[PDB]
């Protein structure tokens, strides 16, 4: 996948966003922006150019699942890669993610090596 792929990292917790941004940097992905919830994410997505989304499950105003479904049903953004982040792997949340078309699913906290595996799984499936 291109080193310059533009990521949007979505989480209401600023520290987690910084952590994810820094793990991405460690993997060679420097083109990264932040959003604090689904509403803020959709506003930033309007700038165009975004190539990858990493979103937390639980956020105010619009949570991760709502954002995922919105992107998937959007005329322009429907195929955008979306990695969902959760606090705990639960059958019901995994299946909710599957049903809505999550490109990936990962439990926080995660290492750079785990992030890399998950991104590579997605790149491989999408031929990126």
């Amino acid at each position: 996948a291109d080193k310059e792929l533009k990521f949007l990292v979505v989480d209401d917790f600023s520290t987690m966003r910084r952590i994810v941004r820094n793990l991405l940097k460690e993997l060679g992905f420097n083109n990264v922006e932040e959003a604090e919830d689904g509403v803020d994410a959709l506003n930033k997505l309007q700038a165009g150019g975004f190539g990858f989304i990493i979103s937390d499950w639980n956020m105010p105003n619009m949570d991760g699942l709502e954002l995922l479904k919105t992107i998937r049903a959007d005329s322009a953004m429907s195929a955008l890669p979306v990695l969902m982040v959760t606090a705990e792997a639960k059958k019901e949340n995994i299946i909710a993610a599957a049903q809505a078309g999550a490109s990936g699913y990962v439990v926080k906290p995660f290492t750079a090596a785990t992030l890399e595996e998950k991104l590579n799984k997605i790149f491989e499936k999408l031929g990126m």
């Binding site: 792997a89 639960k90 059958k91 993610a97 999550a102 990936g104 699913y105 799984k121």
Partner: peptide, 14 residues
Amino acid sequence: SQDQVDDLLDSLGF
């Protein structure tokens, strides 16, 4: 159930 979860993730390519 842990194993149903890991299998579920595997089947989904997650």
